[PDB]
Paper text:
Germline development defective 2 ([name]-2) is among the first reported cytoplasmic non-canonical PAPs that promotes the translation of germline-specific mRNAs by extending their short poly(A) tails in metazoan, such as Caenorhabditis elegans and Xenopus. [name]-2 proteins from different species have various lengths, but share a conserved nucleotidyltransferase (NTase) region composed of a catalytic domain and a central domain.
To understand the structural properties of the NTase region of mammalian [name]-2s, we determined crystal structures of rnGLD-2131-484 and mmGLD-2143-484 at resolution of 2.5 Å, and 2.7 Å with Rfree of 24.3% and 27.1%, respectively. Additionally, the two constructs also contain mutations at catalytic sites (D279A for rnGLD-2131-484 and D213A/D279A double mutations for mmGLD-2143-484), as the yield of wild-type proteins was too low for crystallization experiments. rnGLD-2 is composed of two domains, namely the catalytic domain (from residues 169 to 283) and the central domain (residues 147–168 and 284–480), and shows typical overall architecture of template independent nucleotidyltransferase. Structural comparison with other PAPs containing wild-type catalytic residues indicated that mutation of Asp279 does not affect global or local folding of rnGLD-2. In rnGLD-2, β9 stays closest to the active site, and the overall topology of the β6−β9 sheet is homologous to the yeast [name]-2-related protein Cid1.
Residue numbers in the entry: 148 to 221, 231 to 481
């Protein structure tokens, strides 16, 4: 299943999609690593399970997507004690096939490591279960329509190429972008995506047992929309929408509502530049964008890329196609 591709830009977007999309063999090496590590971690926490989460499973992965793992142990004092124990385990016992494990310090503490078996970089956290839930929310969107995945992928590569796709460095997280693409698709005049949580709350409710949340994409049917915009029309529109129309200073993006909502007067959103509502809990995913200079970098790059693309409808105007493939 693939979109139209009547023009050059749309064809280049599909070409980039098909050569960079995460292949089944990439996902098998990540799953073999996940199962081996769960087995390995269970020596320490026998009541624990290890989940693949994020780009590896949400449908928006590229061959270069790192792996995200979520360790479920039956509030943060425990989460940090477990993460440091797991880390010492990786350093002492697992050093034969687990390279350079490091505790990275962030809102969600992480153990970063490289699997020498798959040669793949991984990020493991402890008990951040919301990432399991939204993995399968996003996955259900990722396959709800054939344009969502090519658009999201070219947009991820685009943001990464322009050094605005790294929340650790002050810019937009991949999750923020994905939510922004999905919001753009949700609010078109003839919309390309509905709200999954409004139409089927039963398949994404917070009472669903974590180990069954992945059943949700098997339940939800595909979305047929009236919009006939091709991939190049939509990539241009997505750059224009955030470059010109979307008021960062007054509104927040709610994929849960499939709407733009006014910024709440709560203290979380009081001084933030960018407000994207996490769909399961109520928090700002773009909270990492807190420096004016970086905020401007995002704004200026949206404007500029929409300009170069408008004039020359070649994907090379905003993303060198030789630097990805």
């Amino acid at each position: 299943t693939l979109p139209e591709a009547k023009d050059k830009l749309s064809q280049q977007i599909l070409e980039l999609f098909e050569t960079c999309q995460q292949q089944a063999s990439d996902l098998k090496k990540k799953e073999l690593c996940r199962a081996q590590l769960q087995r390995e971690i269970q020596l320490l926490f026998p009541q624990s399970r290890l989940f693949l989460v994020g780009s590896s499973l949400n449908g928006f992965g590229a061959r270069s997507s790192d792996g995200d793992l979520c360790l479920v142990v039956k509030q943060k004092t425990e989460a940090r004690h477990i993460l440091t124990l797991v880390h010492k385990h990786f350093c002492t016992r697992l050093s034969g096939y687990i390279e350079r494990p490091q505790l990275i310090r962030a809102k969600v503490p992480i153990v970063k490591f490289r699997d020498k078996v798959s040669c793949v970089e991984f990020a493991l956290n402890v008990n951040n279960t919301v990432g399991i839930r939204n993995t399968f929310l996003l996955r259900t969107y990722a396959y709800l329509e054939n344009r969502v995945r090519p658009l999201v992928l070219v947009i991820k590569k685009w943001a990464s190429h322009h050094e605005i796709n790294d929340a650790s460095r002050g810019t937009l997280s991949s999750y923020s972008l994905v939510l922004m693409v999905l919001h753009y698709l949700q609010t078109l005049p003839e919309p390309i995506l509905p709200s999954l949580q409004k139409i089927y709350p039963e398949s994404f409710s917070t009472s669903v047992q974590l180990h069954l949340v992945h059943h949700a994409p098997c339940n939800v049917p595909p979305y047929l929309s009236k919009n006939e915009s091709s991939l190049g029309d939509l990539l241009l529109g997505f750059l224009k929408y955030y470059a010109t129309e979307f008021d960062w200073n007054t509104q927040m993006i709610s994929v849960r509502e499939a709407k733009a909502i006014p910024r709440p007067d709560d203290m979380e959103w009081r001084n933030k530049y960018i407000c994207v509502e996490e769909p399961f809990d109520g928090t700002n995913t773009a909270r990492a964008v807190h420096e004016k200079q970086k905020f401007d970098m995002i704004k200026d790059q949206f404007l500029k890329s929409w300009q170069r693309l408008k004039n020359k409808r070649d994907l090379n105007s905003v993303l060198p196609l030789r630097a990805a493939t």
